[PDB]
Write a protein that binds this ligand. Sequence first.
Ligand SMILES: *[C@@H](c1c(COP(=O)(O)O)cnc(C)c1O)[C@@H]1C[C@H](C(=O)O)CC1=N
Ligand SMILES: *[C@@H](c1c(COP(=O)(O)O)cnc(C)c1O)[C@@H]1C[C@H](C(=O)O)CC1=N
Ligand SMILES: *[C@@H](c1c(COP(=O)(O)O)cnc(C)c1O)[C@@H]1C[C@H](C(=O)O)CC1=N
Lengths: 404, 404, 404
Amino acid sequence: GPPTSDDIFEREYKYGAHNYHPLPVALERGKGIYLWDVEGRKYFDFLSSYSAVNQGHCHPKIVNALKSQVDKLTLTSRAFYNNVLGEYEEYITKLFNYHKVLPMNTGVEAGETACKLARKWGYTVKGIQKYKAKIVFAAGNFWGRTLSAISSSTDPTSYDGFGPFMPGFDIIPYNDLPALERALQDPNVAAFMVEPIQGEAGVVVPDPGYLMGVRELCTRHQVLFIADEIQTGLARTGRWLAVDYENVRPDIVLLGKALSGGLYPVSAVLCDDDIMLTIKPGEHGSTYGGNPLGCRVAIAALEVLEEENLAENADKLGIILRNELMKLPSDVVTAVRGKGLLNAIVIKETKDWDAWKVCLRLRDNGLLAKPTHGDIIRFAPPLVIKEDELRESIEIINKTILSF
Amino acid sequence: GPPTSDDIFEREYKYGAHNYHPLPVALERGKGIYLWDVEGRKYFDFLSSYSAVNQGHCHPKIVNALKSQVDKLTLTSRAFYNNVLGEYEEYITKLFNYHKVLPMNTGVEAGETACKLARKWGYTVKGIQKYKAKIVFAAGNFWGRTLSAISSSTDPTSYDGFGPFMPGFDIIPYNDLPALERALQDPNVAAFMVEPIQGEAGVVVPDPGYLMGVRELCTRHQVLFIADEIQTGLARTGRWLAVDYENVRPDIVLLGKALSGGLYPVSAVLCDDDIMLTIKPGEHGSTYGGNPLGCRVAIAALEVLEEENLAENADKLGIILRNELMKLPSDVVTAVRGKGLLNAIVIKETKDWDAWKVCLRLRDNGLLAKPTHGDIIRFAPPLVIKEDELRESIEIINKTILSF
Amino acid sequence: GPPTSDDIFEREYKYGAHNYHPLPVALERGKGIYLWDVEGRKYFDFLSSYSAVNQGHCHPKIVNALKSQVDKLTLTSRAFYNNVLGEYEEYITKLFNYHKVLPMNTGVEAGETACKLARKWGYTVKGIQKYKAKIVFAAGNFWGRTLSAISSSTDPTSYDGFGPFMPGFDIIPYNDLPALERALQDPNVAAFMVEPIQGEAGVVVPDPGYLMGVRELCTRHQVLFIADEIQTGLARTGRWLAVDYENVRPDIVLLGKALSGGLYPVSAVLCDDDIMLTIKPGEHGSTYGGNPLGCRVAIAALEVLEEENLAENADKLGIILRNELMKLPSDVVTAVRGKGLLNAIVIKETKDWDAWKVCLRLRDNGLLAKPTHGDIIRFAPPLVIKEDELRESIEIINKTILSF
Ligand SMILES: *[C@@H](c1c(COP(=O)(O)O)cnc(C)c1O)[C@@H]1C[C@H](C(=O)O)CC1=N
Ligand SMILES: *[C@@H](c1c(COP(=O)(O)O)cnc(C)c1O)[C@@H]1C[C@H](C(=O)O)CC1=N
Ligand SMILES: *[C@@H](c1c(COP(=O)(O)O)cnc(C)c1O)[C@@H]1C[C@H](C(=O)O)CC1=N
């Protein structure tokens, strides 16, 4: 016979590392906003694979781009040229209005690249003494799991037991302009890296004006403003980039996750020549970075966001979701927050009943969501969701929450 | 009409970062051992995308695996289970005979994961005080371009201008057992990471017994032996792992590149429970790591290496390649080295005549290869190459060298 | 006639700096737990002047000490000796079991003194190069308003507009042992300064085991543990020192506020000879520090705490206070916290309901308390309060909270 859910759980427990704490559900198919488990049950996806399937699971446009290119050429490395990478480079730099892009594969690779750019520019353009360059981060940041990434983390689960840590990384509170201003008094700071909304920290939305103040302080003190839009970008919050809400232009922009619609690990580092060209030939790279397959996929994934106006849809539907969640009782759900279709609720955790239990019952009533910590549940469905489907989801959430 | 090669060169110059020094050739199609440029000209591929397309370009069996799964489900994240990952996990662990695998995407991610395991094991099992754990590396190593990876580099091009560097990374000479022994006298050393053959260093083959000696020293001093087989593994050197030549079993094995036949960025960290399970749920991850699309690709890629006996082929044909290369005048080609189909020659570089110029002319004659520095040319065709094809290539190599 | 409350407010507004936001009430008399305003109204004191009047207002024994000594001698400076200081020094050092005490006047002065001790010890004993020594602080710390003190603050109200700031001060989260452990990897760290309970942050009580973990980590990495007990000490939390709950011995202890029963500004720095004697004659001082009048007061104030077993009372009555407070509706009072008689509640602040408005009404109902931000009210009565008086006070709080 074919494996049950319990069979699948057991096999991974035996042959796979235990580095995740998954919700016990076993999926075999996805399409648009929906996932199906091996028992044939249907679920609303309200995680979107950490906002990587903004376009919905298996979008036909993106699938067709992948199938078309895989027959021709998939990997040359950048030791040679191919005919696709330049077409993608011209498309994406003109779309976001930066001189250049440096292609990578995963989100954390984009972040590492940005740190290297910041340091290189710091030493060769700004003139910092080697090797005294600093990069400032905000408390609660998440940008991956390399040794460098977790060195900037304030979450012990991320860094405990994995030191000694990368020097030159400082931390200030998020959503705190006086703290940024105090930090940038040090001329050895080369960059401030920040998420326009902190995702994995629990959808922490900064106050109106924060990003304007950030852009202002970074310009004033000759510091690069690095915007990590790997989770918040690409229509998820209701705009091409979440920084578009305050119409601010960062020095470096990071994209990933939804850049491929979930079909291929593609990430990108966008910035102007004065920054980008501090890195000379041979001084940075990646084997699969910029490969023609990922590029065809990324072009299609970006075109989907545009053609279907998913940003406008996320903006419209997000406020409906938040407004409805705000009707839940003040002492079962203690906060609602988000922008566009990146949202979260905080539940009054008891030692009897918590976010994990809510999510188990959400699963049972046909909706997949994951907690982060033990009192916050994230709601992030694919951006192709329609209003009637959203309202059905909302009913499921009401039903579940009010059932405890 | 279509863009020319020069068009392609110019577009990337304008819109892409300048972090590579590519051979001036623009490819648009690849099949088996062959690549075609946009002018229609045909080439032998003797780089194999740094040994990522061992199975040849666009291998029909791996391509079908990609095409089959892309319509079903491509990314859940490991927040949920799917039906594919566990099947891959059981397969690859049993193939290399380790308890568990931890799935990642790129080679440098696999290395970072191994360093994190080494440290976590160092503190929680070996009892090193936090955070005093050291990892030893060999001079000439290349394992990627994160801040941590270049912190272990002895190549200025990799690390200059990118500091400050990761602490706890110590460097010793390659192919030097006394040096290793002295380093392992420090009880705070958690691991030694090393390539069985150094790839980007210029195909540097250590003396017979080196790997056996490393294994013995690591076991004696309770140090983890991390073998980086991201380039040497998967039949490229004539065995499943280069480490198999001396019957050595590393504590952690890293795989990447050809694990997907070039269709998808897939890498793996293999080790037993005592090491793997030092990392608890939530303590390490990656958005695309272990996704079902890459898993189906990897399973197919591994099956191809087995079914077509590519390791055996690489062994036999490698012998021919080195034998025929060694016929070149001592005057002109000062060294020939390699195992299996991972090979290189060293030319007596004059002020006028260098490896780049040779490769430019090899291109002109229908064969693509990349130099390492001024005096080393690597030869690494896909492992599906046939003897007649190989000898045709050898002729091309011969006439090119002698034409200077 | 005599000045009204309104007269008093308007006079200070005209001739005094506007650096405070006081509760509009004008006191003229104080005795034990009670205060009377100029209109004759009587109030419970639930601020205890930031815990400086633990012994109650105008304690007869402390007053008698003042009156007795003021007729004899009040100030010689420490350029000469007097007959009182040595007696106080022996008394307090034997009481807390440290070799020596250094006498100062205000809390922030004791803190400055401890930072100088730590640095001096760092350079002359630990061997840190001048001037590379660091001191680590916990976010949320409050220890005064000198340029140095606000340089370690994470509260913009304290530091904004007052820089540039003192270098060599680093900040980590409170109640976070992994973060402390990470910070102490730097051998240039000389000390960690921390409150056993953060007072002005809103009575933030760390997890059980925190103080033990700090002591252990500081010892392990040769770092001084400075315990700021200026608010938490002297029976307020139900022990002589709040660190006594975990049987922890800091390297340096800071005392102040209630050290004088509110009659005189007296502070003290306690530590052993290997630390204290790093400061040589002429290298630190204060005009009024260690004056005979303050010393007589201090001895009396310390005797009151002991002879009336006020720590025992604080512990017993604080248990009662927190138990009764937790009976308030979980939807209006969202948290209750504290130790002994240092306590606070968190309210569910709305746009129209806040901590300030609550304290205004408490005042109207005969109880004086201070808010923290918009959602915290501190409750800290003098330790001489009796159970029946506490219970009466509690009904005022009940009446007030429920009345909204
Ligand atoms: C994903 C994430 C990254 C890292 O992306 P990657 O998983 O492809 O390497 C970078 N930046 C942002 C803003 C992200 O959201 C996050 C990271 C988080 C973690 O660090 O555990 C889990 C994610 N989904
Ligand atoms: C590829 C390589 C890596 C890194 O793999 P990645 O490019 O997918 O991240 C790790 N280990 C080995 C043995 C490799 O060969 C090398 C790294 C080298 C570099 O550092 O620039 C270039 C490569 N092709
Ligand atoms: C009082 C306080 C100090 C400073 O004492 P001082 O006012 O006599 O100089 C030092 N340490 C602790 C633990 C204290 O509680 C606090 C400081 C706070 C502030 O910084 O504004 C207000 C106080 N009452």
